Each structure stands twice: as C-alpha cells, then as structure tokens.
Amino acid sequence: AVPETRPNHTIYINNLNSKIKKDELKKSLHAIFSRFGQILDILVPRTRTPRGQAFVIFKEVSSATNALRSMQGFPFYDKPMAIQYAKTDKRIP
C-alpha cells in the first residue's frame, strides 16, 4: 500500500521487528519518539499474523514531522524503520 498522505498528528511505522514483545515495543517506541514531543498514544494493532506495524500519535503535528524525518530508515532493534504519515489521523479530539 502506497497511499497519498499529508502531515498530521500520527505516524505509521512498519518493518518493525516482530520478535519483540508488544509491551516492550510500546515502551521502546515511547522512549525514542518522546524526544520529538508529547505522545498521546502508541498503537500496535493485533493482526492475524505478526506484521511489524505501529502508530505513534503526537500531541503536535510538528512533532510527527520531525520524528518522520529524523527516524526514517533508522535501525530499531536491528531493523530499519519505514515511516509514513498516517492515511487518516488517529488523534481523538
């Protein structure tokens, strides 16, 4: 899937390491992405099979923008993160 996106509060990360427990994955994504700004939630959706996908919802769009740029392709648990803006913002105002 290669959808048209535009900046919003939420980034979509895939190519994550599927061997990492979901609770540890959430804590590690929080620790590394909180440098860019306040995080409202981190979602790791349950899929029929493990697929290495997560969403990080930032309080400010600028935080998402800087995280997307800075962390694109960066190793996380020995795999390069692939990052996009979310197709549809997951923030709940």
Add this chain to the structure above:
RNA sequence: GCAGAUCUGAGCCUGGGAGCUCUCUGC
C-alpha cells in the same frame, strides 16, 4: 456493545500485508 488476547487461539483474503471474520477473556 466496549477493551484486551495467536512468532505464545483459529478460518479466510492477499501473494511486494495500513484487509475480513471467528474464537477466547474482562467489563
């Protein structure tokens, strides 16, 4: 209904994974 659960529950769809349904648990 809401929230969770599978490399540690399942059937599909897909066949270059942001898909669907079920089952189970709590409320």
